Amino acid sequence: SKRRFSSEHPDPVETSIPEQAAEIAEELSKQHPLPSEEPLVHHDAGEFKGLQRHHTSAEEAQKLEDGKINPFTGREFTPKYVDILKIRRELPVHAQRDEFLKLYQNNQIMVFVGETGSGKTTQIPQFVLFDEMPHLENTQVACTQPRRVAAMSVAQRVAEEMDVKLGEEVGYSIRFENKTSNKTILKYMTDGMLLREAMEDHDLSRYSCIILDEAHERTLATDILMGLLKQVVKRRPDLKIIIMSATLDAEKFQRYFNDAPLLAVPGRTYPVELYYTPEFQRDYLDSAIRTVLQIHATEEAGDILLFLTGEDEIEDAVRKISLEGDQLVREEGCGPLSVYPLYGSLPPHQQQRIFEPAPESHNGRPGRKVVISTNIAETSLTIDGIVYVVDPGFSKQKVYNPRIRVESLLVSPISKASAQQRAGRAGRTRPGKCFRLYTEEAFQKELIEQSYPEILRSNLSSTVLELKKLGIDDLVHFDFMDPPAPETMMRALEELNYLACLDDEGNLTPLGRLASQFPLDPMLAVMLIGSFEFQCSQEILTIVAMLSVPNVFIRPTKDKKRADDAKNIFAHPDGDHITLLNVYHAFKSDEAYEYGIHKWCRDHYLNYRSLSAADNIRSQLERLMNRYNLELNTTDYESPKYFDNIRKALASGFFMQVAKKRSGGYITVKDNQDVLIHPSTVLGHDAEWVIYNEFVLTSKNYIRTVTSVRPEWLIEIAPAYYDLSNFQKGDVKLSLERIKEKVDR
Ligand SMILES: Nc1ccn([C@@H]2O[C@H](COP(=O)(O)OP(=O)(O)O)[C@@H](O)[C@H]2O)c(=O)n1
Ligand SMILES: [Mg+2]
Ligand code: NI
């Protein structure tokens, strides 16, 4: 039965200021509807006309590959393309090309498996390109990666293998980063971005083929896509699906996909000699740095791959190994050593540096390359020439606390499966070694078998809003390969209801529809959309962007005081959200430009990469707001309302993340949890009530990135949530009781 709404228990949708803005912006759009997406263009000079769709063979394709003229363009192949072509034809998948094609042609859905390095991601989409000829039938081919870096990098690679401009025929699409055009045939993308394209077009009519790659990682977006496409095939007989996975046990995938056929590529990997440590290593970084240097000194030629858990850690490791590395060249006469980082946030031109050849030695002692990388180097891509792996046995993983309902990112021990995959990378070129910084005992006993799929480790808030935009009604019976606890799904509906993205009946509100057009956490989108109603859109727009990137402040452990002093320039007391607005404003100042920008960031102890990212994110966000008719406005700084309005917008999205100061530490509105402010910030005596961006649990529980807020404002902005009937007795409800009555006449 329909829920009743009163002044005592209002409708969260009607009381949502963001909802108002959405309704306003929605109508502005109806005065000028948007044009339909720009069409695709291609080239036919008749190069393919000798080929018949879904009847093609490997030989028929070779002749075209071996022809003068690039069939997809009409221009002629470059001499480097021919060199590359010989190399890539030595990959294992090329032996099975006709076997693969025969399955592609006779089936809608198929499973593909092979060791990392078999040539799945780079080749198979090109195989499909020749048999499908999607540009002739006015379609594309999509290939999804769980990882940003894997998508961008491999797209750069395959563009060269097809001898085409990046962004023209071969292109890539990432969140806030897009290289594509009307010319694009083969599009490598993150599984998240394909999911978003599906939200706008449910049938994905632009793609005659969809390749879900690296399924074994079983990321949240991949699992959803598998669920969708399993339906789409019914509406679309003209669509073909390929599921690629690195694990040879795919039987579960076959059943889920309705007993689809399996193609397996046999392992070509060489033997890898495993080395363990005699006892537990408490500090693995120094253990790792030493192992690398040991190898470079004592071992025969070949390149080293080091697995670490994050950028700051990796950049720190690049520093030390570069330093001690240069010392051995000078002191001990070692061969030269090159050192490259790899992690998620890296720019593309920095990404591609890992493939550079090892330096040539003049000392008669081998020159070498060491790549310090995250789990990206586990299955997602391969670096030619790696004979040596160093495995500290840690990765940055998402954990979930269903009781508290909180997502945390923590460095934690890897699965046994991951350890095997890491070691396997040393045996590609020839026999090689893998040095594990744990004990053979720990590897068998302590490490777990496999990591649970992300769907089980996530809060489903964004997942739910995505599903509803896709037209899914019953979210419990949705076809997930591994269903989440239904309790988690029900919580997400509540939260999105309070955010006024959904009504009490579960239907999308105008806010929800608009919020889904932004690639942000629902809290961030709501905050951003309703921002102009609080007359600070320009400032909130900046703050969302800053929140979309890592902490920009650099605080070396030895240099702490100077770094803190540098930060207090931008620091706003009880303003951590406002601090973010200050650095970005400082970052874009004409003053920092004259100073020189990279030097400015370094001297002020700020990270240029993070701030550069935010700048791009902000631009991409501003573009969405102009498109969907969200007004850009700002209040004069001298105004008494200036900081109030920002705090109001912030509360509008984040009102469910709030804490009140203990009378007799802090208590959180939701769940009534005792917490402490993160040491990274101190608060004055005037902040009884604060909004926090982050819940951080290490032993004791912290809230980070905090900004004070007046509890009155909470009642005004979110009256449905702060309805006292929802609260249980405690310091929190009593205090709330008193703010209510004190509103008089
Ligand atoms: N991002 C990438 C991925 C692969 N490659 C090259 O392409 C070969 C591996 O092909 P692949 O990535 O398609 O193999 P799979 O892991 O997909 O099965 C290797 O010889 C790599 O050197 C590259 O240069 N850059
Ligand atoms: Mg691959
Ligand atoms: Ni049921």
Swiss-Prot record:
<feature type="modified residue" description="Phosphoserine">
    <location>
        <position position="7"/>
    </location>
</feature>
<dbReference type="GO" id="GO:0005681">
    <property type="term" value="C:spliceosomal complex"/>
</dbReference>
<comment type="subunit">
    <text>Component of the NTR complex (NTC-related complex), composed of NTR1, NTR2 and PRP43. Interacts with NTR1 and NTR2. Interacts with SPP382.</text>
</comment>
<dbReference type="GO" id="GO:0003729">
    <property type="term" value="F:mRNA binding"/>
</dbReference>
<feature type="binding site">
    <location>
        <begin position="114"/>
        <end position="121"/>
    </location>
    <ligand>
        <name>ATP</name>
    </ligand>
</feature>
<dbReference type="InterPro" id="IPR048333">
    <property type="entry name" value="HA2_WH"/>
</dbReference>
<keyword id="KW-0378">Hydrolase</keyword>
<feature type="modified residue" description="Phosphoserine">
    <location>
        <position position="6"/>
    </location>
</feature>
<dbReference type="InterPro" id="IPR044756">
    <property type="entry name" value="DHX15_DEXHc"/>
</dbReference>
<dbReference type="GO" id="GO:0071014">
    <property type="term" value="C:post-mRNA release spliceosomal complex"/>
</dbReference>
<dbReference type="GO" id="GO:0003724">
    <property type="term" value="F:RNA helicase activity"/>
</dbReference>
<dbReference type="GO" id="GO:0016887">
    <property type="term" value="F:ATP hydrolysis activity"/>
</dbReference>
<dbReference type="Pfam" id="PF00270">
    <property type="entry name" value="DEAD"/>
</dbReference>
<dbReference type="Pfam" id="PF21010">
    <property type="entry name" value="HA2_C"/>
</dbReference>
<dbReference type="GO" id="GO:0030490">
    <property type="term" value="P:maturation of SSU-rRNA"/>
</dbReference>
<dbReference type="GO" id="GO:0006364">
    <property type="term" value="P:rRNA processing"/>
</dbReference>
<dbReference type="GO" id="GO:0004386">
    <property type="term" value="F:helicase activity"/>
</dbReference>
<feature type="domain" description="Helicase C-terminal">
    <location>
        <begin position="291"/>
        <end position="471"/>
    </location>
</feature>
<dbReference type="GO" id="GO:0005739">
    <property type="term" value="C:mitochondrion"/>
</dbReference>
<feature type="compositionally biased region" description="Basic and acidic residues">
    <location>
        <begin position="56"/>
        <end position="68"/>
    </location>
</feature>
<dbReference type="GO" id="GO:0030686">
    <property type="term" value="C:90S preribosome"/>
</dbReference>
<dbReference type="InterPro" id="IPR014001">
    <property type="entry name" value="Helicase_ATP-bd"/>
</dbReference>
<dbReference type="GO" id="GO:0000463">
    <property type="term" value="P:maturation of LSU-rRNA from tricistronic rRNA transcript (SSU-rRNA, 5.8S rRNA, LSU-rRNA)"/>
</dbReference>
<dbReference type="GO" id="GO:0000466">
    <property type="term" value="P:maturation of 5.8S rRNA from tricistronic rRNA transcript (SSU-rRNA, 5.8S rRNA, LSU-rRNA)"/>
</dbReference>
<feature type="region of interest" description="Disordered">
    <location>
        <begin position="1"/>
        <end position="72"/>
    </location>
</feature>
<dbReference type="InterPro" id="IPR011545">
    <property type="entry name" value="DEAD/DEAH_box_helicase_dom"/>
</dbReference>
<dbReference type="Pfam" id="PF04408">
    <property type="entry name" value="HA2_N"/>
</dbReference>
<dbReference type="InterPro" id="IPR007502">
    <property type="entry name" value="Helicase-assoc_dom"/>
</dbReference>
<dbReference type="GO" id="GO:0005524">
    <property type="term" value="F:ATP binding"/>
</dbReference>
<dbReference type="GO" id="GO:0042273">
    <property type="term" value="P:ribosomal large subunit biogenesis"/>
</dbReference>
<keyword id="KW-0507">mRNA processing</keyword>
<dbReference type="Pfam" id="PF00271">
    <property type="entry name" value="Helicase_C"/>
</dbReference>
<dbReference type="GO" id="GO:0000390">
    <property type="term" value="P:spliceosomal complex disassembly"/>
</dbReference>
<keyword id="KW-0539">Nucleus</keyword>
<dbReference type="GO" id="GO:0005730">
    <property type="term" value="C:nucleolus"/>
</dbReference>
<comment type="function">
    <text>Pre-mRNA processing factor involved in disassembly of spliceosomes after the release of mature mRNA.</text>
</comment>
<dbReference type="GO" id="GO:0032040">
    <property type="term" value="C:small-subunit processome"/>
</dbReference>
<keyword id="KW-0067">ATP-binding</keyword>
<dbReference type="InterPro" id="IPR002464">
    <property type="entry name" value="DNA/RNA_helicase_DEAH_CS"/>
</dbReference>
<dbReference type="InterPro" id="IPR001650">
    <property type="entry name" value="Helicase_C-like"/>
</dbReference>
<dbReference type="InterPro" id="IPR011709">
    <property type="entry name" value="DEAD-box_helicase_OB_fold"/>
</dbReference>
<feature type="domain" description="Helicase ATP-binding">
    <location>
        <begin position="101"/>
        <end position="266"/>
    </location>
</feature>
